[PDB]
């Protein structure tokens, strides 16, 4: 153990069958899929807010990868230095780039 587990300053969870379905019941504006990470909250001082994301979207891809759950997003943040998550807004797809930070307690 020396340098591992990056830091982006954001909370994400694995959209389980329960939650994934709970969203469709509440906000009837999400696709018919059940794979991807859900954004919980973002700290006012992190690459997340600086990159151009929000705590009301859903991750799916990253730097040319397919994410399904939070566990998948984590390894990516610590595996890839450059993160390129695509977020769909309105009726067009957009590419978001966020660079994590290094930190060790």
């Amino acid at each position: 153990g020396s340098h591992m587990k990056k830091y982006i300053g954001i909370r994400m969870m694995s959209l389980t069958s329960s939650k994934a379905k709970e969203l469709k019941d509440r906000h009837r504006d999400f696709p018919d899929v059940i794979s991807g990470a859900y954004i919980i909250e973002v700290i006012p001082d992190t690459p997340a807010e600086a990159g151009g994301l929000k705590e009301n979207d859903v991750i799916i891809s990253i730097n040319g990868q397919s994410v399904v759950s939070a566990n998948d997003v984590s390894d990516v943040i610590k595996r890839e230095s450059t993160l390129n998550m695509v977020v769909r807004r309105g009726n067009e797809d957009i590419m978001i780039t966020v660079i994590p930070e290094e930190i060790d307690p």
Partner: peptide, 7 residues
Amino acid sequence: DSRIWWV
């Protein structure tokens, strides 16, 4: 479940 990942 929740399962929050503060990454």
